[PDB]
Structure 1
C-alpha cells in the first residue's frame, strides 16, 4: 500500500541526515552556473557524455518551463525530470486561474513546496537535486536556487556541483553589478572552464538565456560561437 512513516528523522544533534546526504549527492553532481546580468540571466552546465556513442542532443539539461522561465540542475537526472514536469504543471495551473504567466518567485515557491513535501511525507527520500531557476517578470531579471530541503534563495550569481566552493569564490572575484548579458555569458562559460578536465566543445556544455524576449536555449552554433572568444 505504501509506507506512511517519514524516513527523514531528526538526529540527536538536531540535523536531518537524509537532507544532508541529498546535498552530498547534489555536491558530487555535475557543475552548474547561473549569472544575473543587468538585462538578462544565463544558465550553463557541463554535459560531458561518457563516450562518443551518447547522443548529445537526445536529452537536455536546460529545459524551459514557460515562455519566460527556464531552469537547470546539478544532481540526479531522473529526479530533475520529475521536478521539471511538476514545474510545468504548476505554471499552467497558475496561468489558468490568473490569465498571466506565473512570476518567477511564485513558481520557485510552489516548486520548493513540492520538494519540502518529500522531506516529511511517508516512505520517500529527498530529491537529490538542486535547481537554478531564471526568469524575467515586470521588466526585471530573476535568479533563484532551490535545494533538496525545500529552501530557496535569490542569487545574483552562483554555482553548484563539484568544486562549487572554487566556483563561487571565482564568481565573487569576477562579478560586477553593471555587467552585460554578453559579459555574463562569457563569465558563465569561464566559470565552468575552471574545473572541466578536458577540452570544452559545443557538444560538451549547454547554455540558456532569459531576457525581455523570453527564455530560450542557445543553439550549438552559438555555444561554439561564444566558446571561440
Structure 2
C-alpha cells in the first residue's frame, strides 16, 4: 500500500480499500466471540479479558441489548462498538415507532450494515473497528443470526465466530451439530468452545458472558442467568 492506504476514499491500484483491510485487523486482534443458532433460538458467548482485577464484576460487556428481542455480541474496538450499538438501538426504536411491532432481524442487520458501509465509503470519517453478531428469535420467523464485519455486509449464520481466533472456533462450531440441539445444551457447548479456545495460555483469566434468545425466553433477548450457568461453565471446564 504505502501511498494508497491513507484514506478510505482512495482506491488501491488493484481496486481495494486498504483502510477497511486494516480495520479488519483490529477485529482480528481483539478477543474472540461466538454465536450459535440453536434449534429454537440463538445462543451467544464471548470471552472478555479482565485486563486488571481492579475492575468490578464484568463491565464493558461485549454483549449488548439493541432491542427487546435482539442482542448484539461485538468484538473489536469497544468504544466504536458501543457507539454502533447505540446506532442499532436508535434504528430499532425508530422502526418500532414508524411501522409498529418489532424490527425483523434481517432488516435491522441490513440497515446497520448499510450505515457501516456509509461510514466506510467517505474520506473524512473512518471505517468502524468492530464486528458483531445480531441474534434474535420470534415465533413467526424462528431464530436468525447475522454477522457484520467492520466493512462487509450481514450474512445469515447457523453458527459464527469473530475476533482473535475465528478459524479455531469455527472448526469446533462446524464439528458441533446444530439445528436439532436445544438452546440449553448449546449454552453448555458455546462455553465449552470458548474454553477450548485459548484463555490463559498467553493471556489473563477470562469471563464468560453468555446470552439468550428463543422460545424458552419467548423472545426477550436477555443475558443467561449467570448463577445457574456457572455449572455450564463448569461443564465447559471439564
TM-score by length of 1: 0.91
- Listed one character per residue, the Cα deviations across residues 107-147 of structure 1 (whole Å, up to 9, x for unaligned) are 10111111001111231111010010001132400011011
Per-residue CA deviations over 1:159-218 (Å, capped at 9, x if unaligned) read: 11112111111111223331111121112111111223339xx97110101013221012
Alignment of 1:19-98 (within 5 A): 19-98=20-99
Q: Per the alignment, in what secondary structure is the counterpart of residue 49 of structure 2?
A: coil
Q: Distance in 2 between matches of 1:37 and 1:204?
A: 22
Q: 1:176 to 1:208 in 2, by over 3 A?
A: closer
CA contact (8 A) 1:42 1:207 kept: yes
Cα RMSD, aligned residues only: 1.8
- Structure 1: where are the runs of 5+ without partners? 1-5
Cα offset, 1:80, TM superposition: 0.8
Describe how 1:66-145 pairs up with structure 2 within 5 A: 66-137=67-138, 138-145=140-147
Q: What residue number does 2:3 align with?
A: none
State the match for 2:165 in structure 1.
163
Distance in 2 (alpha carbons) for counterparts of 1:177 and 1:140? 11
TM (norm. structure 2) is 0.88
Q: Tell me the SS of whatever aligns to 1:47.
A: strand
* Partners of 2:47 and 2:206 within 8 A in 1: no
Q: Deviations over 1:43-89 (max 9, x none)?
A: 11011211211113333221111111001111011011111101010
* Aligned positions, number: 222
Give yes or no for contact 1:203–1:220 (8 Å, CA) kept in 2: no
The whole-number CA distance in structure 2 between the counterparts of 1:49 and 1:209 is 22
Out of 212, 219, 228, the position equivalent to 1:209 is: 212
CA contact (8 A) 1:48 1:205 kept: no
Query: Are the counterparts in 2 of residues 7 and 124 from structure 1 also a CA contact under 8 Å?
Result: no
Runs (4+) off by over 3 Å:
none
